[PDB]
Amino acid sequence: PPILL
Amino acid sequence: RQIKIAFQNRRLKAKK
């Protein structure tokens, strides 16, 4: 879940 | 927690 909020 | 470098890191944990 990278920089996906 | 992937981009546990900044966003998924909160600078350390996860936030920005």
Describe the fold and architecture.
The complex is a heterodimer of chains A (5) and B (16). Chain A has 5 residues and is mostly loops. Chain A is flat. The termini of chain A are close together. Chain B is low in regular secondary structure and 16 residues long.
| E-strand count of chain B | 0
- The number of helices of chain B is 0
First and last CA, distance of chain A: 8 Å
Q: What pair of chains forms the biggest interface?
A: A-B, 5 and 6 residues
Structural class of chain B: little secondary structure
Identify the overall geometry of chain A. flat
Q: What overall geometry of chain B do the principal axes of the alpha carbons give?
A: globular
User: What Rg of chain B, in angstroms, do the CA atoms define?
Assistant: 5 Å
Main sheet characteristics of chain B: none
Beta fraction of the residues of chain A? under 5%
Please state the oligomeric state of the protein chains shown.
heterodimer
Share of helix among residues of chain B? under 10%
Count of individual helical segments of chain A? 0
Question: Mind telling me the C-alpha Rg of chain A?
Answer: 4 Å
Strand content of chain B: under 5%
Percentage of residues assigned to helices of chain A: under 10%
PDB class: immune system
Keywords: helix, cyclolinopeptide, immunosupression, antennapedia(43-58), immune system
Assembly: dimeric
Entry title: NMR structure of immunosuppressory peptide containing cyclolinopeptide X and antennapedia(43-58) sequences
Briefly, what is this?
The complex is a heterodimer of chains A (5) and B (16). Chain A is largely without helices or strands.
Which helices and strands, and how do they pair?
The complex is a heterodimer of chains A (5) and B (16).
Chain A (H helix, E strand, L loop, with lengths): L5
Chain B lengths: L16
